C-alpha cells in the first residue's frame, strides 16, 4: 500500500499531544524510525517543517527511551534528505547548540549515536561545520578520543575522526580556528607506535587529518603555520619515529611517508629536521633511505611513489638541500671504509639501471634538485661519468642525451627528457654545453621530423620542447648553433607549423591534465608514471613563448 503514510501522520499526533506520557512518545518515535529507516516517507515527514522542530524539542528530554529513538530518527532524516533537514535545523534558533548537548550525554549509547547524528548534520554544510566548532566540538571530540585510548579505541574513535574531518576538510575558517585554539598539539599522542584492523583504520584517519591541515591546496600561510606548529609541538618528530620503527603495516608506513612529505614541503625548519634523521645500521640518513627504496625494484610501486614524493617535498623551495644533493655527484672525499652510499651515487645508478621505473624516478628526482636553481644547474654540468677501462669520460648531461638514441623504453626517455628540459630551461650555459656536441641537434631534428605513429608522439613532442628551449634560452655565444640558424634548421628539416604541432602533443596527452592538478604522484599503476606535476608547469610556462619565438 502507498498509504503507509496514513498510520504515520497519526504517530506525529501522539508526539504533539501526549508528551506527558514518555512511554508512548518513546514508542511513537521508535515506530517512526522503523517506518522511515526501512525514501518516500521522509519527504512527507519533513514537508510539515514544525515536525522537525518538534523532534528537536523532544531531544531535550533526558528520558533514555525518548532521546535514543529521537537521535536515531533525526539521523535517518539527515542521512536521506541532508540539505533540507540541515536547513530547517540551521534556521531554527539554538538548533545546532542543542544537538551538541547530546555529545555531553553521560549514557554512552546516546553520545555515540550522537556523534553519528552530527556527522549527518555537518556533511557538506560549511556554516553548520563552523557552528559545531563554535560549540566546543574540537575539544570535546579530542577528549573522547583520549578517553577511548586513541587509535586503540573502537568504532567510537573512528566516528569522532570522521566528524573531525567533516569540520576541517574544505573548511579554512575551521582549520584556522583549530590551529588558533592549540588543538594541533593534541594530535601528537595519536602517534605512539598489536595492530588490529581497527587500529589501522583509526590511524589512517588521524594521518589524513594531519594532511588536511597542511595540504598544498590550502591558502599558503595556513599550511605554513600548521607546519610550524607541528614542528614546535613535536608532531613532525613523532611521525619520523614511526618511519624507522619495526613491525608497522606496510600501508600505515606508505601513508606516514606521504604525510611527512606534506608536513615538510616548503618549510626549511622541517626539511632541515627531516634530513637530520638517521636510521640504525652504518647509520643511514633519511634522504639515503628514501632514495634506496625509490630505486629498489622489489619494493611495492605504491611505496616508491611515496618516497619520491617525500624527496621532492624535501627539495621544494629548498636550495640548501638541492646543493647538498648535487655536491654528492661532485665527490670531495674518500671514505676509507667501503661502507657509505650517497644520494648522487644512488641517483646515477638509477638513471642508468635497466628498470625504467628507476630511470624515471631518478630523473625526476634530479630535476627536482635543479628547479629554479641556476647555481646547481651549472654545477651538474661538471659531473663526469666513467666509461670503459680504456676510454675517456662522458658528462652526465651527454650520457642522458645518449640514452635517448638507444633502444630505450619511452618511460625512461620521458623521464630523461623532463630532466634535460628542466636542466636547460633558464640556463644559457647548459644550452651551450648541449649544443656543443654536434650529435645532438641532428638527433632532435631527426626524431621530431619523422612521422612515428601515436605512441612515439609523446617523445617527439618532448624533443621539440628541448630543441625549442635550445633556441629560446640561447645566448648566441656558440657560433656553430645560434638562434636564427636553429630556426632555419627547423624550417628546412621539419617545417615550423609542423614543429609547433609536435610540441603540442605534450599538453594534449591524455594524462597531462591529471598530472597538473596536485603535487602527489597520482599513478594507478607503473604504466601511468609518465608526467611529473612540476614538469606540467614548465610546459605551460614555456609552450606559448617558444611558439612566439619561432617567428
Numbering used by the authors: 55 to 92, 111 to 265, 271 to 358, 360 to 629
What does the paper say about this structure?
The golgin p115, which forms stable homodimers, is recruited to membranes in a nucleotide-dependent manner by the guanosine triphosphatase (GTPase) Rab1a and belongs to the family of tethers containing an extended coiled-coil region. p115 is among the best characterized representatives of long coiled-coil tethers. The architecture of p115 comprises a long central coiled-coil region, a large globular N-terminal domain and a C-terminal acidic region. p115 binds to a specific set of soluble N-ethylmaleimide-sensitive-factor attachment protein receptors (SNAREs), aiding formation of a cis-SNARE complex that promotes the antero-grade ER-to-Golgi transport by targeting COP II vesicles to the Golgi apparatus. In addition to its major role in exocytotic transport, p115 functions in retrograde Golgi-to-ER trans-port, intra-Golgi transport and Golgi biogenesis of the Golgi apparatus, due to essential interactions with the coat-protein complex I (COP I) subunit β-COP and the conserved-oligomeric-Golgi complex (COG) subunit COG2.
We used a construct comprising the globular head region of p115 (p115GHR, residues Asp54 to Tyr629) for crystallization. The fragment lacks 53 N-terminal residues that are predicted to be disordered and the C-terminal coiled-coil domain (p115CC). p115GHR consists of a multi-helical β-catenin-like armadillo fold arranged in a regular right-handed superhelix. We observe 10 classical armadillo repeats (ARM1-ARM10) and one non-canonical repeat which we termed USO repeat, after the yeast homolog of p115, Uso1p. ARM1 and ARM2 are connected by a highly acidic and flexible loop (residues 92–110), which is not visible in the electron density. The armadillo repeats exhibit long loops (5 to 13 residues) in ARM5-ARM9. This structural motif of elongated loops culminates in the formation of a short helix inserted in the H2-H3 loop (37 residues) of the terminal USO repeat which we named the USO helix. It folds back into the superhelical groove, leading to a globular C-terminus of p115GHR and covering helices H3 of ARM8-ARM9, while the USO helix points into the center of the groove. In the crystal structure, a dimeric arrangement between p115GHR molecules results from their packing along a dyad axis. The USO helix and the USO repeat helix H2 are part of the dimer interface which covers only 635 Å2 (∼2.6%) of the total 24,000 Å2 of solvent-accessible surface (SAS).
